[PDB]
């Protein structure tokens, strides 16, 4: 099987600069018809891959003329002119010269933008959830940049790590920000034994942690 190897980018990349994504093969992708059987795709979160380039250098219908393919034999580049916020996602190369067809491992692209403080919102357990013996305290940390962020929970002033689950988005293709959910899940029994619930975000945009709280 032909092995395909991609290199990572020096992330984050700078808007308006050219970006080169590297793809290398363990065997020549040149076929006897004089064409080189290499494709390039972009995959966005929750979506299928989109074809950018086929046969090493042909741009697909509907793709920005900022995207071009180059290379020869075992060494290939996807060239992005004037990189834009909408170019964030994961770029794949693929060989089709020999069975089985094989893909590279993907190259994620992230873009630098202006620093942006998170919008922090805390929500106590709903009346509805408390009836089933569960108590989830939800905190959103939305539209921040850079992605570096630390979230802490406090119950009556003491830090709580057990029962915390975090989830976050990839960089937004429109505003170039990140967002995160932090959920502290307690039993109703433990929730009703404490009063103060705090979610605290440490981000470079504020000297002090950004804190939202409520009292049961």
């Amino acid at each position: 099987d032909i092995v395909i190897t991609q290199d990572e980018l020096s992330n984050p990349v700078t808007s308006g600069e050219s970006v080169s994504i590297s793809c290398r093969s363990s065997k020549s992708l040149l076929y006897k018809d004089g064409k080189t059987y290499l494709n390039w795709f972009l995959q966005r979160p929750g979506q299928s891959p989109q074809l950018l380039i086929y046969l090493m250098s042909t741009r697909a219908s509907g793709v920005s003329d900022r995207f071009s393919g180059s290379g020869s034999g075992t060494d290939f580049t996807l060239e992005i002119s004037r990189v834009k916020a909408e170019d964030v996602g994961v770029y794949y190369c693929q060989q089709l010269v020999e069975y089985p067809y094989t893909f590279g491992g993907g190259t994620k692209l992230e873009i630098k933008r202006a620093d942006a403080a998170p919008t922090v919102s805390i929500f106590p357990p709903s009346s509805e959830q408390l009836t089933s013996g569960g108590a989830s305290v939800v905190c959103f940390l939305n539209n921040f940049y850079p992605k570096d962020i630390n979230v802490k929970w406090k119950i009556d002033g003491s830090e709580r790590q057990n029962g915390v689950l975090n989830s976050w988005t990839d960089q937004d293709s429109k505003d170039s920000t990140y967002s995160m959910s932090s959920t502290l899940t307690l039993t109703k029994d433990e929730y009703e034994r404490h009063n103060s619930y705090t979610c605290e975000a440490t981000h470079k945009t504020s000297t002090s942690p950004i804190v939202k709280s409520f009292n049961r």
């Binding site: 697909a60 709903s126 959103f140 988005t169």
Partner: protein, 207 residues
């Protein structure tokens, strides 16, 4: 290309996925595990009844096509936890004469598990801009689809990847609207869970 809906299957069972579009072009099937890359399963060119398999999938996958309904099928047999993935179909080209892998369907989420289907519990998250949300807890399997006001509220939405805790998934979705517009202009989350044939709408009202 359009694919069939999400599937739950037992270990050892078979499933048959569909891909609706085949006179000139072929159909490729591709596997992707959550947070991992792409693996080619096989191709069929229904015009010439030609199929070719990745040797890795030879004993796992059978590709067929109904030319009349321009539908391609992939049957996966002897299912295991390692077959849990998103499966895509994409168009297959002809040498230098066409594009290749140029139209991909949305994918089908296949989960292989002994665990029972469980619909989501949807809980409202209420307090110049206001943030609301919905907590989607205790469902199995993936996926869920979350919209706000049946898709008419799409700016200012964040829907987070699910996490798996004690064999059940949980995710949350937030929406941010101008403060003067809530509760005067209603905000409702809609949570569709294909595997349980269930959709739940929760209107967000002040606590």
């Amino acid at each position: 290309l359009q694919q069939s809906g999400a599937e739950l299957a037992r270990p050892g069972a078979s499933v048959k996925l569909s891909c609706k579009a085949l006179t000139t072009y072929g159909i490729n099937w591709v596997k992707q595990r959550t947070g991992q890359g792409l693996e080619w399963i096989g191709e069929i060119y229904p015009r010439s009844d030609y199929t070719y398999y990745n040797e890795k999938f030879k004993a796992k996958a059978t590709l067929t096509a109904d030319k009349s309904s321009s539908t391609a099928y992939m049957e996966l047999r002897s299912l295991t936890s390692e077959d849990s993935a998103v499966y895509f179909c994409a168009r297959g080209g002809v040498n230098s004469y066409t594009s290749h892998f140029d139209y991909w369907a949305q994918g089908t989420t296949l989960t292989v598990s002994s665990a029972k289907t469980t619909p989501p519990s949807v809980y409202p998250l209420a307090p110049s801009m206001v943030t609301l949300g919905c907590l989607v807890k205790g469902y199995f399997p993936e996926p869920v689809t979350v919209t706000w006001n049946s898709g008419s509220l799409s700016s200012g939405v964040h829907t987070f990847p699910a996490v798996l805790q004690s064999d059940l998934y949980t995710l949350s979705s937030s929406v941010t609207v101008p403060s003067s517009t809530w509760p005067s202009q209603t905000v409702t989350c809609n949570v569709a869970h294909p595997a349980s044939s269930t959709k739940v709408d929760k209107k967000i009202v002040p606590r």
